[PDB]
Amino acid sequence: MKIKQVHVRASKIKLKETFTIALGTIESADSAIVEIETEEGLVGYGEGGPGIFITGETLAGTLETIELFGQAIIGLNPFNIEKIHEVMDKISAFAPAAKAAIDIACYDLMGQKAQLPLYQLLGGYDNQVITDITLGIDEPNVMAQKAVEKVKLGFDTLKIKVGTGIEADIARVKAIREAVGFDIKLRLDANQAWTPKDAVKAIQALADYQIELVEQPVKRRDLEGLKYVTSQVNTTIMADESCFDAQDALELVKKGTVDVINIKLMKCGGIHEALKINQICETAGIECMIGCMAEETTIGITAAAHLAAAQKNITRADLDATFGLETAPVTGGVSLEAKPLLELGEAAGLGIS
Ligand SMILES: CC(C)C[C@H](N)C(=O)N[C@@H](Cc1ccc(O)cc1)C(=O)O
Ligand SMILES: [Mg+2]
Known about the structure:
InterPro entries: Dipeptide_epimerase, Enolase-like_C_sf, Enolase-like_N, Enolase_C-like, Mandel_Rmase/mucon_lact_enz_CS, Mandelate_racemase_C, Mandelate_racemase_N_dom
Strand order of the largest sheet: 5-6-7-8-9-10-11-12
Pfam families: MR_MLE_C, MR_MLE_N
Radius of gyration: 19 Å
Protein name: Hydrophobic dipeptide epimerase
Distance between the termini: 20 Å
Binding site for substrate: 134, 159-161, 191, 264, 292-295, 318-320
Structural class: alpha/beta
Number of domains: 2
CATH class of the largest domain: Alpha Beta
Family: Belongs to the mandelate racemase/muconate lactonizing enzyme family.
CATH superfamily of the largest domain: Enolase-like C-terminal domain
Bound molecules: a molecule of 2 linked components (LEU-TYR), magnesium ion
Number of strands: 13
Strand content: 15-25%
CATH architecture of the largest domain: Alpha-Beta Barrel
CATH topology of the largest domain: TIM Barrel
Helix content: 25-40%
């Protein structure tokens, strides 16, 4: 098959509520939605959802880059994902959201051409994924109350955002555990807010609160400090901002920096690159959690879920971006409904539109 044309459009969707993390706030999911059409008529959908305080990418920059990529892959076979990434990598030294947008659309096309759900093409380990739901930074009693709400919706794993100071961060977790009890799994995410010593201190202070894992406790570049935390606590430590791509992953495995790694299609440039990170991690005995940017919609989330369902080593999931969307840009895929279970159907590719 051959790519005939590539179209992209801006999508700006308000979130039901501003989300606060240690890095800042997000109130609108602004993404680039791409449609790749083949000469035979098949259409693939992709998306680039950039998180400025994570990668620095912007919607305007992502749109321009996708157009450059699009005009360079005309005539290529979607299955030649190897050449498609080579072409994009030669065009741009860094544009994970734009690359993911193209990459996702190609995988959607592969699935449609093969007449198979994407999760079958990517590994076939399962046809669904169970996701947690993240609670944004707020006052202890508020977060605790929202925690009760989410658990009533059926969520058994909650991702707690922290990072305004260990004193308050500790109070947030205690209140949450106290409110929902110990039957719920609680994972913390500090989005780089703590120093290596404060991190150890906070984690130890929460020893009796049954913490599943702590995500990116220190600054992204502080790998010595991240490792310090990891080698100082029995609590599982996960890297997020410290790991963008396969190259970063190889570096972390080499140094024994963390216990688990957070994979985001918008950080690595798509499914093709994400698979590399998981293979490297799996070989090193490092499990992976599939994550997401708040700026992504059904397209990005559905793609991530198919990859997570497909791969055995991607044992955790944090795909809750759609739960906060006011509207859905396309039909099909993971819905806007706030629910832990994301069941992927039998529809070919992403099962979108
Ligand atoms: C609201 C949900 C989708 C947040 C998601 N689970 C998450 O925590 N993502 C990042 C943090 C983040 C990225 C981008 C934006 O705009 C806000 C927050 C993470 O730290 O895992
Ligand atoms: Mg994180």
